[PDB]
Amino acid sequence: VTNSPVVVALDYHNRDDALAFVDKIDPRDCRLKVGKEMFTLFGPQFVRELQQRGFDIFLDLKFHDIPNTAAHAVAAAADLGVWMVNVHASGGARMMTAAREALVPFGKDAPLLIAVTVLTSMEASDLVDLGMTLSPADYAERLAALTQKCGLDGVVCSAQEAVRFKQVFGQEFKLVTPGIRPQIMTPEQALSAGVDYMVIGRPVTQSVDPAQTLKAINASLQR
Amino acid sequence: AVTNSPVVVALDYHNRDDALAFVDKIDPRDCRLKVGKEMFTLFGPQFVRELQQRGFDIFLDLKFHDIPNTAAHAVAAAADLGVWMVNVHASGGARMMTAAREALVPFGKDAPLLIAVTVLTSMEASDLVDLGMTLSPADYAERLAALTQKCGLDGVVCSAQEAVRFKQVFGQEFKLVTPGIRPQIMTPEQALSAGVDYMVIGRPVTQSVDPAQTLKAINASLQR
């Protein structure tokens, strides 16, 4: 457990380099994100190492597959004991649902189940290629609602959508947003916009004494 | 680590000890192996190496769908892992598929085959209503198939029901990977005929008693 909304992106290609960083900060201070980089290189095994140091882990693998498989994937993350796991909304309802229903037997131990909507990187251009008429913004929201309708715990979403999404979807719908920078929201702006978990990377990881860096972020968030 | 079979058997076990048992019953010459989200989430690259050290070729079936730089990182990592095939989601878009490819370029012909998922085998018209897609699965997969080819990847995962039309439209060097293959839902026989380049077979083999016979029979049937 921790009170911070901060999730630090571990995007190392060296395992012992990451734990060094990791050892310079504290679980009470924040949670960690393991994504496709570290997980393709290192698998569940390294997640365990982070978990062994008592951290809460966001397994950011955005499962996008057939329902049966997605289901099995998400269960596996829960068996792994991660804190949060995401899926792609664009996999559709049955996938999301089966994802969700898979997590039922872990009861109150089941991780947070979050859906990617429209990737933060995808521009309008990119969406026409796919033959999609709605803006990224409009389409992310449609994807948000589908997710909510499917019973998931929240959505990953841009700062730029954070305000309207909280107003529209409310507060038990967790808002996960990336690209937060102390100095693109600030940790403070993000708090205000209502986002629940704010993913911070280089700002923290590239800080000499990132722990002071951290420390300033949440103190700044105290008010 | 060549075989002449177009067979790729799906390893979808919850327990490793069982997976390797099955593995020990069959031969790299006889088929290829596909590792998906299940076994990978449970057992990591480390388990891929186990299979690869027993001589098998692996299809790392993780269908990377993420931002460009990231998918790029994962695909390169798949390569360094030394797998034979790796896929990505077409729906990640051109910039993503592109970064994937280019990531692989430093690996010369050591590079794994880079395959794109188009419209997942399971998705019905209904499912696409939700997303707001006007085109049928079929039309949409094809749109996605061309984007893949235009992006310069080696082929697409696709349904047997689309295998023939895609071979005709995209040609034969455009690899077609299809699941839902069943000895006796195309058959190994029917699938080849359609022109599908690699046929993914699950339970028929894994849940075959004497699957090594089963495998060798599969390829006997393709003696033709």
From Swiss-Prot, chain A:
Q: What is its EC number?
A: 4.1.1.23
List the Gene3D superfamilies: Aldolase class I (3.20.20.70)
Query: Catalytic center at which residues?
Result: 62
Q: Signal sequence: where?
A: none
Q: Which one of the record's GO molecular function terms can you name?
A: carboxy-lyase activity
| Catalytic activity, reaction form | orotidine 5'-phosphate + H(+) = UMP + CO2
User: What InterPro entries would the database entry show?
Assistant: Aldolase_TIM, OMPdecase, OMPdecase_AS, OMPdecase_bac, OMPdeCOase_dom, RibuloseP-bd_barrel
Q: Mind telling me which Pfam families this protein's record contains?
A: OMPdecase
SUPFAM superfamilies registered for this protein in UniProt: Ribulose-phoshate binding barrel
What's this protein's family per the entry?
Belongs to the OMP decarboxylase family. Type 1 subfamily.
Q: What does this protein do?
A: Catalyzes the decarboxylation of orotidine 5'-monophosphate (OMP) to uridine 5'-monophosphate (UMP).
Query: What interactions and quaternary structure are annotated?
Result: Homodimer.
What PANTHER family does UniProt report for this protein, alphabetically?
A: OROTIDINE 5'-PHOSPHATE DECARBOXYLASE (PTHR32119:SF2)
List the protein's name.
Answer: Orotidine 5'-phosphate decarboxylase
Organism of derivation? Escherichia coli (strain K12)
Q: What gene is this protein translated from?
A: pyrF
